[PDB]
Structure 1
Amino acid sequence: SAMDDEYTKLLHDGIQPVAAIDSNFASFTYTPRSLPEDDTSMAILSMLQDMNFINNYKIDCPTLARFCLMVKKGYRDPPYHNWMHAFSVSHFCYLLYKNLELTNYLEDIEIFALFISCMCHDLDHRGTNNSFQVASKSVLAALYSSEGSVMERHHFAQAIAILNTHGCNIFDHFSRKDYQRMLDLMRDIILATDLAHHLRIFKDLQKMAEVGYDRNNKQHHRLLLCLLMTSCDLSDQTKGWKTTRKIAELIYKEFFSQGDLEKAMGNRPMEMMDREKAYIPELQISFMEHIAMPIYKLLQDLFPKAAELYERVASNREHWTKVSHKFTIRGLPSNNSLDFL
């Protein structure tokens, strides 16, 4: 009933101009988590319209409205891996489109697949990682653990189940070859969100940036799509310090909750998921140094206009070192009590 009325307005009221969402909506400085959640499905439509994908691919507006709502409704509400994460990852894809001239690098359909993949790439996340699915002998591991990337295979399978839901296949008028192409792209792009995949291809990403992007090289296209998706996935770290701090809070709430579950199973959590061992400033510096900063350095090497993104991640990294001293309790706790000992 609720989705029906939301559908009715999304379809019949018209698509809001993207500039009416916010004066800075298309800037790397904009924080899409600032958008009220109730406004995000209309913002998805506005972005799709502004990138001309609705007209170029003749997407049926009722199908697209239903698709967007079905995708939003396909996310659960863990602290981090929720619909607002998918919305902000999708928004960053729109930023790359508006700021970095992707049409000089990628086919139209590849850019479209990236954006749709961003919307779908964490569908039905339960707030636990791939190792946990295997350790807990979850249904998802029973399905996919022999292939790896258990959660990401599930996210892709969930996106297909939405497309296979009557009235929701935004691609169903595509040619057979274009349809196969779109779903293949979605597979590769969603599967690239496994950071284990990113780490596997990282040297090939380095090699691509070194020799220089070849628009006629099909492997360069695939590699670039993977890097862009990862850049979208981690894009929370490219905003201000306030965003980085809040996003850290959400990640560790989620992580520590999984760690609490691992302990109740008799298993030793990773220290970054153990609330009794994790030292957040050191983990955030490590994550920025070894994972986040190299990704945006690569993005800058390929796209010089992405320099500000790398400098932001580097800045946020310096902020963690500056505030680290505040995790040590000097003097007495604010209650004047040593009871916590």
Structure 2
Amino acid sequence: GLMQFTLPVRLCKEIELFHFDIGPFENMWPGIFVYMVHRSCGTSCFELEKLCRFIMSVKKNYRRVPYHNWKHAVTVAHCMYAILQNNHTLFTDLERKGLLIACLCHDLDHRGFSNSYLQKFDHPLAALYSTSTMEQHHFSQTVSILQLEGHNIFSTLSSSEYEQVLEIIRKAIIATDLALYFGNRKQLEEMYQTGSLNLNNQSHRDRVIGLMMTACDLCSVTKLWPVTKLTANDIYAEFWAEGDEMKKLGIQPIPMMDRDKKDEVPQGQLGFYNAVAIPCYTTLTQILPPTEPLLKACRDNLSQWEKVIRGEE
């Protein structure tokens, strides 16, 4: 109970900032998460023994893939931590509990392949879940781990509170399906601009949490340039492996997934910043003004890709 987690001075300061990188020391990532739960939620939110056992079972169920790995899970949780800490009074007790867990679990048992590839391969998961295939699987894996003996971190919640928190987690994880992002952002854009956005309306909170999940999931574009640039290598290592697997099924992959078209990456990143990333953090900043540093960092990285195209790097 009186056992706090403390980080070294540089981490203690920088972990509060949106652009924090969790570093290459994997054995510190569990401690970083517990630190973030304790400051975000409270030292009383979870039984420490149960929380520690939950974290280590989650870690075990992330695979050794270039990008959709344990490091991604903790990185996405940190971006959510930074949002919650900068918007103290906007979020309920159950939301702060649910969302850090949802972020840690949102890509559980990822194989490094898109929903598209599972459908074309005719994977069993594509027959069980026709839409948001991998994301329904990630939620299914989260419930499985929560039901392991000694792993129920929500055990002190009432029946109805437990159902509310698992419903927060399910919607949050489903919302990481980028196919659902475009419509969700358009609706939030219209609600904000016509002034009908209402944070007491539950269907409205769901939309706003959904956008926070996209923002946290894409947060590679909100880091300092050298982190953003090196993370791109891992992203394209997965995309290009899936491209290779598309060619084995006798299907020309999109250029994003074709390693033969490496030369077009700079222009592809521009399109992504312009069509997905900048719109995401723009709308997020309108609804939650203190998340503006995410938008600033994204714009800084857009400018760096413009420099790559002009041969200045």
TM range (shorter): over 0.9
Question: What code does the residue aligned with 1:24 have?
Answer: E
Q: Is contact 1:192-1:229 (8 Å) kept?
A: yes
State the AA in 2 paired with 1:99. Answer: N
1:22 corresponds to: 12
Question: Structure 1 residue 14: deviation in Å?
Answer: 4.6
CA distance in 2, matches of 1:184, 1:49: 22
Is 1:112–2:97 an aligned residue pair? yes
Q: CA deviation at 1:174?
A: 1.5
- Equivalent residue for 2:72, pick from 67, 81, 85: 85
* Contact 2:285/2:291, CA 8 A, preserved across alignment: yes
**Corresponding residue number in structure 2 for 1:51:** 40
Q: Distance in 1 between matches of 2:4 and 2:42?
A: 13
Distance across 2 between alignment mates of 1:100 and 1:247? 27
Structure 1 residue aligned with 2:118, among 133, 146, 150? 133
1:197 matched residue in structure 2: 180
Structure 1 consecutive aligned stretches of length 4 or more whose deviation exceeds 6 Å:
none
CA contact (8 A) 2:41 2:97 kept: no
Alignment CA distance shift 1:46-1:297 (3 Å): same
C-alpha separation in 2, matches of 1:157 and 1:131: 19
1:78·1:127 contact (CA, 8 Å) conserved in 2?
A: yes
The letter for the 1-side match of 2:68 is H
2:210 pairs with 207, 222, 226, which one?
226
Conserved 8 A contact 1:152-1:193 = yes
How does 1:45-194 map onto structure 2 within 5 Å? 45-55=34-44, 57=45, 59-101=46-88, 103-104=89-90, 106-145=91-130, 148-194=131-177
Q: Alignment partner of 2:187: what SS?
A: helix
Q: How far apart are 1:141 and its partner, in Å?
A: 1.1
Residues in 1 aligned to 2:244 and 2:288: alpha-carbon distance in whole angstroms: 41
Q: CA shift at 1:327, angstroms?
A: 11
| Separation in structure 1 between the aligned mates of residue 34 and residue 24 of structure 2, nearest angstrom | 14
Shift of 1:203: 1.5
- Could you tell me which runs of 5 or more consecutive residues in structure 2 were left unpaired when the two chains were aligned: none
Q: 1:275 to 1:35 in 2, by over 3 A?
A: closer
Post-superposition Cα deviations, 1:85-118, rounded to whole Å, max 9, x if no partner, equal 01000001111122233x32x3221222111100
Matched, 1:292 2:281: no
In structure 2, C-alpha distance between the alignment counterparts of 1:277 and 1:162, rounded to whole Å: 40
Higher relative contact order (CA 8 A, sep 6+): 2
Aligned pair count reads 310
> Residue 13 and residue 175 in structure 1: after superposition, are their counterparts in 2 closer, same or farther (change >3 A)?
closer
In the other structure, the counterpart of 2:308 is 323
Which of 7, 21, 27 is 1:31 aligned to? 21
Q: With the length of structure 1 as denominator, give the TM-score of the two structures.
A: 0.86
Whether the 8 Å CA contact 2:73–2:103 is kept in 1: the answer is: yes
Q: CA deviation at 1:184?
A: 1.0
2: CA distance, partners of 1:299 / 1:18: 29
Please name the residue that 1:303 is paired with. 288
CA distance in structure 2 between the aligned counterparts of 1:45 and 1:16, rounded to whole angstroms: 7
- Opposite residue 255 of structure 1, the aligned amino acid is F
Identity value in percent:
36
Specify whether residues 126 and 13 from structure 1 end up closer, same or farther in structure 2 by C-alpha distance, changes over 3 A only. farther
Q: Secondary structure at the match of 2:261?
A: coil
- For the residues of structure 1 that align with 2:174 and 2:151, how far apart are their CA atoms? 22
Structure 1 residues without counterparts, runs of 5 or longer: 1-11, 329-341
**TM-score after normalising by structure 2:** 0.93
Match of 1:274 among 252, 258, 265: 258
1:312 to 294, 297, 308: 297
